[PDB]
TrEMBL record, chain B:
<feature type="domain" description="Proline utilization A N-terminal">
    <location>
        <begin position="7"/>
        <end position="104"/>
    </location>
</feature>
<feature type="binding site">
    <location>
        <position position="315"/>
    </location>
    <ligand>
        <name>FAD</name>
    </ligand>
</feature>
<feature type="binding site">
    <location>
        <position position="291"/>
    </location>
    <ligand>
        <name>FAD</name>
    </ligand>
</feature>
<comment type="pathway">
    <text>Amino-acid degradation; L-proline degradation into L-glutamate; L-glutamate from L-proline: step 2/2.</text>
</comment>
<dbReference type="GO" id="GO:0003842">
    <property type="term" value="F:L-glutamate gamma-semialdehyde dehydrogenase activity"/>
</dbReference>
<feature type="binding site">
    <location>
        <position position="292"/>
    </location>
    <ligand>
        <name>FAD</name>
    </ligand>
</feature>
<feature type="binding site">
    <location>
        <position position="261"/>
    </location>
    <ligand>
        <name>FAD</name>
    </ligand>
</feature>
<keyword id="KW-0285">Flavoprotein</keyword>
<dbReference type="GO" id="GO:0000166">
    <property type="term" value="F:nucleotide binding"/>
</dbReference>
<dbReference type="InterPro" id="IPR005932">
    <property type="entry name" value="RocA"/>
</dbReference>
<dbReference type="GO" id="GO:0009898">
    <property type="term" value="C:cytoplasmic side of plasma membrane"/>
</dbReference>
<feature type="binding site">
    <location>
        <position position="188"/>
    </location>
    <ligand>
        <name>(S)-lactate</name>
    </ligand>
</feature>
<feature type="binding site">
    <location>
        <position position="288"/>
    </location>
    <ligand>
        <name>FAD</name>
    </ligand>
</feature>
<dbReference type="InterPro" id="IPR016161">
    <property type="entry name" value="Ald_DH/histidinol_DH"/>
</dbReference>
<keyword id="KW-0547">Nucleotide-binding</keyword>
<feature type="domain" description="Aldehyde dehydrogenase">
    <location>
        <begin position="497"/>
        <end position="956"/>
    </location>
</feature>
<keyword id="KW-0274">FAD</keyword>
């Protein structure tokens, strides 16, 4: 109502007048910090450098690291802004001061002292131990015992504390009603593998530590608040809160954060309230807007997910007022902490509490330490119940927090910045955000929508979590079939059968595969050759349409197709779903690529002449596919050849033949003309060379081992009698991929990314990291954390989402990988070797081996398993040299925050796909066109804009258009 | 001059007034011709179809041919325009087309012509008689044309005595108007010599002069007038010289005329020179001043060769030019008799008033118009001046087609005075405006201009004609040198020397070439490998700059570099120059292509992430080059490898090793860093496999024979120890190229294009036509004309421009080609075999063999010499089948005017470069990217937008830009 609004605006106006002139420290341009923040708000390029420098700063531990990074981020001393070895001391001290702005101490004992001082100034606190996204069980224990230690200290002191002044009640309690000891805990700091993919396991592990903390909290009648973090963990955290609450249904001092910036929150808050009523318990909510807005937006768009946050700032403000109102309406069962620095927001809560006549012991106000000082003073004066969020700890564990503060204070849409950095437009600042919302909503090829990668599986969703076990079960009702060849549109059975089994459980037979002899392979090639002329003459637009149809067919079977892979080749849930989406991506991308390349282009501009340049297919393509990306790679190579006008004879890998059969199913459903796609699984020793040597073959697409690929290249180079063309070769032959960890690397990112690159899908990826090359100065520290996280992971059946990795492809892979592991143990020193499950299954321990140098076999030879080599580089030059020391050059990674070292790696770390500050696997179509040279391939990049040309050859038609001195004028003619 | 101008306008106004609205027959919408033209003028698509149909019509000699072409040009009966309605359709259309041919032609034969001329005299018109024909194909045809004039003159000789003189104001009563000879004929010089070409300036003049003289003696015998028509700019200087010489042999004889074309920029000077020349020699001349008949042709032809357009490009400029020059002629009436040849009323009025103002005697100027055109204008002249002469051509439709289509173009052009006056209802004041007034009123990327092909040699220029013999003599002062290897910026000499000689005169030794052993090759490879890292790291823009410098260096030495080729490998003057310009083109094009490809593309649009896609070189490239395009292909392959950042070891063909040395000279002058380019001529039998097999070679660019190409492909496929990359193969392996001569083909165009395709440079081109496939129905006539033109050509030293072709490359080639000729002579039957010069030289006769079928060797094997197979196809489908019957697919041609047959060819005649209605050689950079598949190559096209990528491999750098939940927003980002 406009009546409540008026009272709110008028209260905001009084809040501002009582604050007149007083600015927050961060906006005081008479101190270094205010000058630095000011220039960051005025110069975006400078903000980016300063903020990144702050992040890397605590890792700059030598005089060399500091001096060089300063110059790389701020340029020469004669070139920096005026407010910016002496240079080292000046910057260090200023940056250190900026860090302690937001912390009440580095240590527990320091924190307690400073906390006891804040009470004397009249301030309550909620204490947080700085830390998040823990990397190991041992780290989670340190975090847990720190709270235990903190609570012991506070227990011994709270008895001596006078309760903060109030309107009455218990003088031993704060304001007469609030427990004097109040702490906040970050759930992800309690379990290093927190992941909604393993929902139940994440909840339990976190719950068990939270319960241990909660028990100590309750002993001193304290308050525990459970912080909310990134959207990825919101449902996990809600469930932790509910279970703990029900375990102690009568204990009222337990709170949960709810983030008004989430679209989910209107429902989440309704649900929680209804839940509390249903169970006859009381709850407490700290309502916040949200701390991870940029991250959530970015992460959502990188995965083609719904962005979980509102995208207009005033919508979070409007949501907050809505939800606060709802909470206050429900004050009988829901205690309320208002957590905002926004004077409009605060004034709104205050008026709503008055309008709903809410008792004062049912709501309090909270702000972050070091921030919005006058706002905080205003709250203290006018309401009297102010609690400071007071975090403590060191700069590296606190970095995420600290950077979030600088973001928060300097964002364009920051209420604080708009109030205290720009000429404050008080009326605009205090307007009902709903009105603001409505006004800003007011302001805001070939018929095909442009390409977008298919949405990734999203385990924050209940239905996605439930989908896998259901579809795995459904696949199990359909095992035991005999799969035939598919030639010229017909099923062809043979006598030679090879069973395909579950690698995590070999006694489970999934089906039997007919093998084609050379007679059937010959038939398929002949079928292909016969279908060719009509296919080649089919319009590129029509050909692309079949791919589009096949993509819709696949999209509709996404979870079913994934489940088959989970069982047949031992893909983890995410790995399986990613394999199918990539297949879909290839279909959609190559469709568009053929449509683009399908139209003849006029070349040259001379008059009286028309030159058209255009492409044509080659003929019969042999597609020889690997087992490790059984749908994605197969479909990529086959659809590529098919859309470009060729016809395909396709040999799937034996152990993934059912996945190969999925191509048959999809192209069938798309109505593909007979003979255009043929499925001929067979024994390579029987029909391998035959397929490659055949004179009717014009193109060979292959992915697999270097040995095989190089043999194919050599044999295909011969022109046999009758062979119309020199055989085109598309080969991808794997790698020995390294990630370099520079001495300034962010280890909290580096460690889990390295672990995933190495052991995701048991390391069975051409792209997998099999070498981590670590700079001398961070070696011991990085290695300890890597091994520590590794020890937390579990090896077991891929159908169980609690397992990090599982059995390798087949027994041959197991025997060969184990031999490599033994060689590695003699060359270096084992750092970690995981347990494996007892009994059947092709299990190889997750294995990390140190002491490795370029001369070693496991530093050179592709193992294609869960064996990671760790190599100690003396400096960054050697790290680069070592990275380039194999005969492969497929992928590579580097964790570094030195612009110079990154610039050097971009130039000199010459792999087909180099990744900076993330894992070196998970290449997406269009975004990361995939493939390398040297012994890794012939420089063809799947999923990119040069790929389709490899399956075709260009032709030019030149026409003399002049007849008897008369030529037609064309639009783009050079004329006069 | 406003006073003169006012008389002119007023006189024009009376002229239009006296016309009384009458329209010339072609603009009479009452008749079919008027309707056809009116609709052609309103609908450009119809115009194109109608004009092309008229062109092909006289060759539709059977009912099916006719019926089919009608449907193909105009569609089914029910869809074509009303005036086209009524095989009956064949009869109606035939009838209308014949009538429109008779509009512009006074008859088909001499006798018919004579009778119709007398009828015109009776109506008051004089005549200048022309025998339809131009651009003759043989001596036999030139003789037929000459004898037709002689026959014509004998007939008029007997008749003229009976003719009463046309009425005049005074003079001799036995002469027309009292002063003009009754017999006036016009002759086209290019109808008198089939090889008329300023490249053979003197030989062309003499041949034409010799026939012109015989005609002229007969003309003088009856006291007649002879006018020499002017044709395309290519022959203008030749025709002028022919006139000068004839005039001087008969300085007494006043009745010899010459056409000058006011649409030429040269014409002001040409008229001035001719006038002065006449004064210096004390002789009188006669000039028929015209604007010009070949405007579109000249514009197109100049643009296609990057020549200066010889014509004004604003129509009013030709008009203003005409008035200037006319005035100058009238002022010089003492020595220059004037024929005003124009249908433009403004022009005519200008001449008339200018002649009255200068009081020119009426016996010094007369008016002329084309028969069948501008009827009311023609009658207007008769009434006002009395002295009007019709240009009256005669002959058949095929010989008359050029003339006829010129008339259609002339009456229908947007800029046509007749169209504006009689179709477009233009304002008279505007039509009569001083054209000088009209003239006044009507008047790249990376800092680099867009690519343009280098200007071709232009032998209409006297300095160009004179340049060749002088540079050849200069080259002869440079003979006898020893050419060393060039390695790492140093000259390396070996003691194994091979002489290179003049193939047209083997006793002339051009120099001695050092041969590289395997030792020096290895040194070259090692030097390239060592220069590679710094070259690879050189800015692509900087790399391109070296190519541009090399281009500039070559452009300065164009004639010199050309002369070397004339002597060393026996290129003809134009062939040599075109080789050098093509080298320059590769340099300019590939520079620009590298600048385009050298900038990294952001790929994908996900935020928090940057993917950059870019290209890197491979390493050391072996360039193995042919002798047949010794600068062009060499510079092509090498500069491509170089600009993309590879280093080159270059093996020129032994017999063109000096041309190879030009690359050393050009790259030296460009300042290319040492080791980037190395020159190692050597014995294939010594260092061939060694260069190809070397572990440090990453790429091999080869152009030459299939046998060697396939050998290289096979050997390169093996990966030796130490070999970093799978060898990239770029191979161009020749062709067995056919041209199809369809039964509706324009034979006047086909014959000389086939001859040139087969015998240009002795047939030593991969692109050369070695098979001409001719439809049953035109075979005998095509062959007669082809053999007749061949017989006209002379075989001899390429330094003498009079020769069509000369000796082949070397002794081995001479013997091998001759064996093939003998093979062909036993498979088929010899149709033509030229004389060759006596004595020294590697001469092989220009040879044509008929009776050839697909199963014959010389229908399959590439001969690479002046041996043409003639094949007789039963129908179009067999022609296509036969065209596709070899293992090669490089180039191809088709002469046809059937939309369906062309479409079938575009689809089914699957060669790398297909040419419609022109020769299949002389592909230009950009306009015709050159190369094919099958046994002709591996689908790489030099001079095209896909070429550079073959010398590189793609790389992607993917960067996670988010730090601590903060990422910079980019422009191309998908956001909110
Ligand atoms: C004591 C306390 C505890 C907190 N605990 C947590 C926690 O456990 N988890 C958590 O996630 N947050 C938490 N927060 C909130 C977060 O740390 C910020 O302090 C808060 O979001 C800023 O809101 P505001 O009213 O102070 O400032 P404002 O300037 O009013 O609000 C800024 C907020 O708007 C939102 N926003 C910014 N841009 C947009 C946009 N384009 N579209 C939509 N919304 C936008 C963001 O949430 C941003 O934080 C807590 C805050 C306090 C004071």
């Amino acid at each position: 109502n406009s009546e409540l609004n008026t009272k709110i605006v008028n209260r905001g106006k009084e809040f501002f007048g009582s604050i007149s002139g007083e600015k927050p420290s961060l906006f005081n341009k008479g101190a270094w910090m205010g000058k630095a923040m000011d220039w960051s708000m005025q110069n975006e390029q400078f903000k980016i450098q300063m903020f990144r420098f702050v992040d890397v700063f605590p890792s700059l531990t030598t005089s060399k690291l500091l001096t060089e990074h300063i110059r790389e981020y701020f340029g020469n001393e004669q070139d920096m802004p005026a407010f910016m070895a002496v240079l080292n001391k000046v910057l260090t001290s200023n940056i250190e001061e900026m860090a302690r702005q937001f912390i009440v101490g580095e240590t527990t004992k320091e924190a307690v002292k400073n906390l006891e001082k804040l009470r004397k100034d009249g301030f309550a606190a909620v204490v947080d131990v700085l830390g998040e996204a823990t990397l190991s069980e041992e780290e989670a224990e340190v975090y847990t015992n720190t709270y235990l230690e903190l609570l012991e200290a506070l227990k011994k002191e709270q008895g001596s504390w006078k309760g903060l002044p109030g309107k009455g009640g218990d003088p031993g309690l704060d304001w007469g009603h609030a427990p004097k000891v109040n702490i906040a805990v970050k759930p992800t700091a309690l379990f290093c593998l927190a992941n909604p993919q393993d929902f139940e396991g994440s909840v339990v592990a976190i719950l068990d530590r939270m319960r241990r903390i909660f028990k100590k909290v309750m002993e001193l009648n304290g308050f525990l608040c459970i912080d909310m973090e990134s959207y990825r963990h919101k449902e996990i955290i809600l469930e932790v809160f509910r279970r703990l609450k029900l375990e102690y249904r009568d204990y009222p001092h337990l709170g949960i954060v709810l983030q008004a910036y989430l679209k989910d929150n209107d429902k989440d808050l309704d649900d929680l309230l209804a839940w509390a009523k249903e169970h006859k318990v009381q709850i407490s909510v700290r309502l916040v807007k949200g701390a991870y807005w940029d991250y959530e937006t970015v992460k959502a768009k990188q995965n083609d997910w719904e962005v979980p946050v509102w995208t207009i700032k005033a919508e979070s403000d409007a949501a907050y007022e809505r939800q606060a109102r709802k909470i206050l309406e429900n004050h009988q069962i829901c205690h309320f902490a208002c957590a905002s620095h926004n004077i409009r927001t605060i004034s709104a809560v205050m008026e709503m509490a008055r309008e709903l006549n809410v008792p004062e012991d049912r709501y309090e106000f909270q702000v972050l330490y070091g921030m919005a000082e006058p706002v905080r003073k205003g709250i203290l004066k006018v309401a009297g119940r102010i609690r400071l969020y007071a975090p403590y700890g060191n700069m590296v564990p606190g970095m995420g927090y600290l950077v979030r503060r600088l973001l928060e204070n300097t964002a364009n849409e920051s209420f604080l910045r708009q109030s205290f950095a720009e000429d404050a437009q008080i009326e605009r600042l205090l307007e009902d955000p709903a009105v603001t919302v409505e006004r800003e909503r007011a302001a805001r090829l070939g018929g095909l929508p442009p390409f977008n990668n298919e949405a990734m599986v999203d385990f924050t969703r209940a239905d996605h979590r439930a989908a896998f076990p259901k579809h795995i079960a459904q696949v199990r009702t359909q095992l035991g079939k005999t799969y035939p060849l598919f030639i010229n549109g017909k099923e062809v059975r043979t006598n030679d059968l090879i069973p395909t089994v579950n690698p995590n459980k070999p006694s489970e037979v999934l089906g039997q595969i007919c093998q084609a002899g050379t007679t059937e392979v010959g038939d398929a090639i002949a079928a292909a050759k016969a279908a060719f002329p009509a296919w080649r003459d089919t319009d590129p637009r029509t050909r692309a349409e079949y791919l589009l149809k096949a993509a819709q067919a696949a999209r509709k079977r996404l979870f079913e197709l994934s489940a088959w892979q989970v069982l047949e080749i031992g893909k983890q849930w995410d790995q399986a779903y990613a394999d199918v989406t990539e297949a879909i991506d290839f279909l959609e991308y190559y469709a568009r690529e053929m449509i683009r390349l399908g139209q003849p282009q006029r070349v040259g501009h001379a008059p009286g002449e028309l030159n058209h340049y255009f492409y044509e297919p080659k003929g019969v393509a042999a597609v020889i596919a690997p087992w490790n990306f059984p749908l994605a790679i197969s479909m990529g190579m086959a659809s590529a050849a098919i859309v470009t006008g060729n016809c395909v004879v396709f040999k799937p890998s034996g152990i993934t033949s059912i996945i190969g059969w999925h191509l048959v199913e999809l192209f069938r459903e798309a109505g593909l003309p007979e003979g255009v796609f043929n499925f001929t699984p067979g024994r390579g020793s029987v029909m391998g060379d035959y397929l490659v040597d055949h004179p009717d073959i014009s193109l060979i697409a292959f992915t697999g081992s270097m040995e095989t690929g190089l043999r194919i290249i050599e044999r295909a180079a011969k022109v046999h009698p009758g062979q119309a063309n020199v055989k085109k070769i598309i080969s991808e032959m794997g790698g020995k991929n390294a990630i370099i960890i520079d001495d300034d690397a962010d280890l909290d990112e580096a460690v889990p990314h390295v672990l995933y690159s190495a052991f995701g899908f048991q390391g069975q990826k051409c792209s997998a990291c099999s070498r981590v090359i670590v700079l001398d100065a961070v070696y011991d520290k990085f290695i300890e954390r890597l091994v520590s996280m590794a020890k937390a992971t579990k090896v077991g059946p891929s159908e169980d989402p609690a397992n990090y990795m599982g059995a390798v492809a087949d027994d041959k892979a197991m025997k060969s990988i184990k031999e490599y592991a033994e060689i590695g143990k003699r060359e270096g020193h084992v750092l970690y070797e995981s347990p494996v499950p007892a009994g059947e299954g092709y299990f190889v321990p997750m294995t990390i081996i140190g002491g490795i140098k370029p001369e070693h076999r496991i530093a050179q030879e592709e193992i294609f398993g869960p064996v990671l080599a760790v190599m100690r580089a003396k400096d960054f030059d050697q790290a680069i040299e070592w990275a380039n020391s194999t005969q492969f050059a497929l992928t590579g990674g580097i964790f570094s925050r030195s612009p110079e070292h990154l610039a050097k790696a971009r130039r000199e770390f010459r792999v087909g796909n180099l990744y900076i500050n993330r894992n070196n696997t998970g290449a997406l179509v269009e975004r990361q066109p995939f493939g390398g040279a040297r012994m890794s391939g012939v420089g063809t990049k799947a999923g990119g804009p040069d790929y389709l040309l490899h399956f075709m050859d260009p032709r030019v038609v030149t026409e003399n258009t002049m007849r008897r001195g008369f030529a037609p004028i064309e639009e783009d003619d050079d004329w006069v």
